[PDB]
Design a protein around this nucleic acid. Structure first.
Lengths: 75, 134, 79, 115, 47, 176
RNA sequence: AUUGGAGGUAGAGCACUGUUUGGGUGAGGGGUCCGUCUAGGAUUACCAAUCUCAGAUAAACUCCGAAUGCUAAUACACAU
RNA sequence: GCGGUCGCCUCCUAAAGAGUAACGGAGGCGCUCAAAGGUUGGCUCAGAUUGGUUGGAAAUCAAUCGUAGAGUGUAAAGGUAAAAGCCAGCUUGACUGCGAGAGCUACAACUCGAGCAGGUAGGAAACUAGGACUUAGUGAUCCGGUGGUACCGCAUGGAAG
RNA sequence: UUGGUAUUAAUUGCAUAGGAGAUAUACCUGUUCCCAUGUCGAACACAGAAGUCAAGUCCUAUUGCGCUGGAAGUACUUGGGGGUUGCCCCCUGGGAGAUAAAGACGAUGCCAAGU
C-alpha cells in the first residue's frame, strides 16, 4: 500500500473582484482561511474569515500599516 | 558513500536539468578546477571512487577538494513489478550537475600534476569537465 | 503592604534589644520593629550587648584565635 | 534591574490597543484621555484637523487643583459644545477608568458630553 | 460520554440540545435563555 | 529607617570617590532582595515544601508565594505545578526594614567566616548570596528547625557597577 | 490595446526551515607524568559547545521576484 | 486474483486566478471545551548568557540579551504582538425570529452574511456578542420514539389515529 | 524650547557623540484619602512636587550597523522559426534576481503654552 489514497478535497481560494468594482453591500470579496489581506471600512471579516463588503463602492487596495488591506471607498 | 545523516523527506522528485550552473560556478578554495560542460546525476560511490585515485596520484597534498554534496535520495524499482502501486526503495545518494559547474578544488598542486588524476577523473566521471584556472 | 496583612508582621511581645536595634510594631523580627527604646514594651537587653563585631572575624579584630599556626607543627627541643 | 519602562510609551502602546474600540473620528471627534505626572490635556480630534486643543493643565493654562477637579477640562468640554459636537468620541488610552480620568470623564458626562 | 438536552419550566419540556460534559463535570447545567415568549429571559434547565 | 540617613550622608563622599559626582539626587542605589527556597523537591509530596512556605512566612518578608516551572522536567515528572520553592521578592523601605538583620544580626549570628561571596558577579552591579540554614531571627526560628529547607539572598543595585556595589553593601556591615 | 489589481511559477540566493564544503573559533570527552585526602595540570587527539568567514544546497526553503496568463474598467474592433 | 482502498480536513503534485489528474507524496480526523466560548481589564514568549545552598542539561530564583528563533485544546497549512498568544473579573449570545446581499456549483448540498426586530449579556459608556485563531471531529429519505401543537379528526360528537 | 496628535512606514530604527531642562515633560516624595498588589506605593492609584537632567525625553552631529536603491549587462520568457533533440540555437517583444552606482542619523500636517 501507500497510505496515500488518503485524499484532500481542494476548494476555491483567492479573489472575487479585486479591482474597484461596485460590489454589492454584503457581498463576498476574498476567500480566506488565513488572512493575507486585512480589512477596512464597509468591509467585514467573515465567520469563514474572508472579507465581505457592507456598502457598495470602489474596493481598491491599500498599503496601510506596511501591510495589505481592503476597504471600500464609496462611489 | 557519505550520506546526509538526517533527511526530512526520504523520497524526492527526480528534479529537472536545465541550462547553466546555479552557484559555485567558479573555483573557490582551490587553485584548479574542472568545468562541467554537461549535466548528469553523479553518484557518491563514483565520486569518492575518483577521490582515492586522486590520493593515488595526488599523494601528499592537503586542501584538494570536490565541491558538491550528494543531496538526492535517488530511487529505482525492481524486476517484474508492474507500473505504480506505490513507489520504490531509496538505493542511495546523488548530486545534480548543471553546465558550467565547477566541481573540483585543488591546493598545493603543480601544473604538471594538475591534469593527471584529474585526467583519471575524466575517466571516473560521467560528465564532460575540463581544466580550469582561477 | 497588602490590606489587612493575614501574613506575618505579628507582634510577639518581646524586644529586638541592642545592636539589632529594633523595638516593636506590626512587625515580627530582626530589622523591622521600630526605632526607640525610651518607652519600653519590654526593655532592650535580652538578645545581645555586643554588635556585629559579635561576629568573630572582627572582635577587637578577633585576633584572640592567635596564637596558632607556627607551633604547628614544630618549634620544640625534643628528640 | 534597569528601571521601569516608561509610562508614556506604554500608554501610547495601550492607547494604540484601545483606539480601535474608540475611533469614528470624523463627525464624532475624540476628547483625549491624558495624564502627566501633574495634570492632563484636553483635545477633540477628528481626522487630522483636530479643531481645538488646550492645556487645562499644569503648563501655565490650568485650574488650581486640577487634580480631582471638576474643571479638568470641562471648559474645553463646553468648547466642544461651542463647536457643535456634543455626543462624540471620548478616549480611554492606556488608562484606568478609576483615577483622575474619571474626574474629567464623569465631569464631561456632567457637561453634557457622553462617555 | 456526552449527550443531553435542555429543558425549562414549561418550554414544551425541552428547549435546547447540548452535551457539555456529561462524563467530565457531571453536576448540572443551568442556563438562562429565551422562551416561546422571548422578550424576557427565564432561568433554564437540563433534561 | 536608620540607614537612609547614614546611607546618603555616608555615600556623599563615596559619590565623589566613585563614578558620578554632581548627580546628587540620582546616584547609585540599592533595589531589592529575593528570598527563595527554590529547592525543587516538590515531587515527594510538595507538602514539606508547604511547610517551607511557612518557613518563608516565618522569615516573614511578605506573603509566601510560589512559582511554576516553565517546562515540567522528565527527570522530575512534576507536571508543571505551582509549589516549587518560595518567593519574596521583597523591596524598598521593607528592605530597609530588613538589612539590619543582614549587617548586625544575620551573618554575625551564624559566624561563618564573614560570609565571603566575591564570586557573586552578576555582570551589572548586582550581587548574589545564599544560605544553608537559618538560626537567624531570635524567638522566631526555633522548634521547627529540625531541617532548614534553605533560602537564597540576592541583592541588586540600580547601578551596573559591580565594584561600587561591593563598596555599596560592603560600605556597611559585611566584608568579603 | 492601455490602465488596474491579484497570484510566488520559472529563475535566482540562503533573508528563515533543511542539508552541507572548507577556514577560524573553543569547555569537554581518550594517549606522558605528580596521581588516586590527590582532584587532576594534561599532549596533539575526532567533533574542535556555539558562533565567524567564504562555498553551496531544495517539491513539500522563500528576504525577493518575473516574463507569461487570469480578472476589473476603459478604448477600439467586431458580432454576439 | 492477493493485498490495500472506498468517508471528510490540511500541504505538495497544480503548471504564479481557480481546476485537478495515479494503487502519487505527507498527514490525519472520525474530538474536546459551561469554559480553551463571549465580554471587560491587564501581561508578553521561547530561548541564550551570568551569578547564586541541596543542583541536573532544564527544576526554582534574580539579572542581562531576547519579534516571537514560543504559544496558539487537539496533525498540517495559512494566520498570529491593536494579538488568535498569557492571566484575572463579569460571564452564559455556543440568543430567538430572521435575513437583504452574496460566494461555491449537475443536483443535493456547502461557504458566509450587511441590516432589522424581540429582548438580552457583558462593558461606566461607547463598543462587542448568532461558538473555539479558520479549516477534520460527519452522513439522504423512510420507519419508530420524545415533548408541545390555535390542525384534521371520516353522519355526528368525542376518542382512536 | 517643548508637549499633544495624526500621516508617510523601518530612506525613517538602532549605535556613537554633545546639549537641554528653568516653558514644560520627566525623574521623584509619601501612602493619607480612592485605588492598591497570585507579594509590592513594584505596578496602579491618590496626594505633594522636597531634590533632580542620573535616566527617559527632545534637539544636534556622525553612514558604525540595519533601512532604502538602480543599472549597464544578465537569468528567465510570450509570439515566431530552425536544428542532433530526456535537448540546443536563433529572431522579435518582455524582463528579473543578484548586483548595484547611491541615498539615508526621517519627513508632513494638525493645538496649548519660555513658541
Amino acid at each position: 500500500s501507500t497510505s496515500n489514497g488518503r485524499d484532500s478535497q481542494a476548494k476555491r481560494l483567492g479573489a472575487k473582484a479585486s479591482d474597484g468594482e461596485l460590489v454589492s453591500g454584503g457581498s463576498i470579496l476574498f476567500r480566506q482561511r488565513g488572512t493575507h489581506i486585512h480589512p477596512g471600512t464597509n468591509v467585514g471579516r467573515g465567520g469563514d474569515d474572508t472579507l465581505f463588503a457592507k456598502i457598495e463602492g470602489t474596493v481598491k487596495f491599500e498599503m496601510k500599516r506596511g501591510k495589505k488591506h481592503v476597504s471600500v471607498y464609496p462611489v | 558513500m557519505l550520506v546526509p545523516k538526517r533527511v526530512k523527506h526520504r523520497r524526492e522528485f527526480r528534479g529537472k536539468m536545465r541550462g547553466y550552473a546555479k552557484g559555485g560556478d567558479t573555483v573557490s578554495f582551490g587553485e584548479y578546477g574542472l568545468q562541467a560542460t554537461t549535466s548528469h546525476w553523479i553518484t557518491n560511490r563514483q565520486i569518492e571512487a575518483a577521490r582515492i585515485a586522486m590520493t593515488r596520484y595526488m599523494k601528499r597534498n592537503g586542501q584538494v577538494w570536490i565541491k558538491i554534496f550528494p543531496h538526492k535520495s535517488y530511487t529505482a524499482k525492481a524486476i517484474g513489478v508492474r507500473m505504480g502501486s506505490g513507489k520504490g526503495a531509496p538505493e542511495g545518494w546523488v548530486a545534480p550537475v548543471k553546465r558550467g559547474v565547477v566541481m573540483f578544488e585543488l591546493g598545493g598542486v603543480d601544473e604538471a600534476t594538475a591534469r593527471e588524476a584529474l585526467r583519471l577523473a575524466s575517466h571516473k566521471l560521467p560528465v564532460k569537465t575540463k581544466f580550469v584556472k582561477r | 503592604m497588602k490590606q489587612n496583612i493575614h501574613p506575618n508582621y505579628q507582634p510577639v511581645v518581646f524586644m529586638d534589644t541592642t545592636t539589632g536595634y529594633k523595638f516593636l510594631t506590626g512587625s515580627t523580627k530582626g530589622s523591622k520593629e521600630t526605632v526607640e527604646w525610651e518607652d519600653g514594651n519590654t526593655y532592650p537587653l535580652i538578645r545581645v550587648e555586643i554588635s556585629s563585631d559579635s561576629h568573630p572575624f572582627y572582635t577587637g579584630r578577633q585576633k584572640f584565635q592567635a596564637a596558632d599556626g607556627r607551633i604547628a607543627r614544630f618549634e620544640k627541643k625534643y628528640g | 534591574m534597569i528601571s521601569k519602562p516608561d509610562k508614556n510609551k506604554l500608554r501610547q502602546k495601550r492607547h494604540t490597543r484601545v483606539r480601535g474600540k474608540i475611533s469614528g473620528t470624523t463627525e464624532t471627534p475624540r476628547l483625549n484621555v491624558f495624564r502627566s505626572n501633574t495634570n492632563i490635556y484636553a483635545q477633540v480630534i477628528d481626522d487630522v484637523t483636530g479643531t481645538t486643543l488646550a492645556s487645562a493643565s499644569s503648563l501655565k493654562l490650568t485650574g488650581t487643583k486640577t487634580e480631582q477637579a471638576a474643571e479638568v477640562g470641562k471648559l474645553v468640554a463646553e468648547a466642544a459644545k461651542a463647536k457643535g459636537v456634543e455626543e462624540v468620541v471620548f478616549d480611554r488610552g492606556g488608562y484606568l477608568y478609576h483615577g483622575r480620568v474619571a474626574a474629567l470623564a464623569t465631569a464631561a458626562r456632567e457637561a453634557g458630553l457622553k462617555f | 460520554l456526552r449527550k443531553a438536552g435542555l429543558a425549562c419550566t414549561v418550554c414544551g419540556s425541552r428547549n435546547y440540545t447540548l452535551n457539555l460534559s456529561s462524563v467530565a463535570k457531571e453536576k448540572r447545567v443551568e442556563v438562562k435563555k429565551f422562551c416561546r415568549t422571548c422578550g424576557k429571559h427565564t432561568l433554564h434547565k437540563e433534561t | 529607617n536608620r540607614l537612609k540617613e547614614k546611607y546618603t550622608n555616608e555615600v556623599v563622599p563615596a559619590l565623589t570617590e566613585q563614578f558620578n559626582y554632581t548627580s546628587i539626587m540620582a546616584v547609585p542605589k540599592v533595589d531589592k532582595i529575593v528570598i527563595n527556597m527554590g529547592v525543587g523537591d516538590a515531587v515527594n509530596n510538595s507538602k514539606n515544601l508547604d511547610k517551607a512556605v511557612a518557613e518563608l512566612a516565618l522569615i516573614s518578608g511578605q506573603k509566601p508565594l510560589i512559582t511554576k516551572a516553565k517546562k515540567s522536567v522528565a527527570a522530575f515528572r512534576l507536571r508543571e505545578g505551582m509549589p516549587i520553592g518560595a518567593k519574596v521578592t521583597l523591596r524598598g523601605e521593607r528592605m530597609f526594614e530588613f538589612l539590619d538583620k543582614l549587617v548586625t544580626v544575620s551573618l554575625p549570628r551564624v559566624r561563618d567566616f564573614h560570609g565571603v561571596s566575591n564570586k557573586a558577579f552578576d555582570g551589572r552591579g548586582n550581587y548574589t548570596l545564599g544560605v544553608k540554614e537559618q538560626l537567624i531571627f531570635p524567638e522566631i526560628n526555633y522548634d521547627d528547625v529540625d531541617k532548614v529547607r534553605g533560602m537564597d539572598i540576592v541583592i541588586v543595585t540600580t547601578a551596573n557597577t559591580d565594584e561600587e556595589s561591593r563598596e555599596l553593601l560592603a560600605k556597611l556591615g559585611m566584608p568579603f
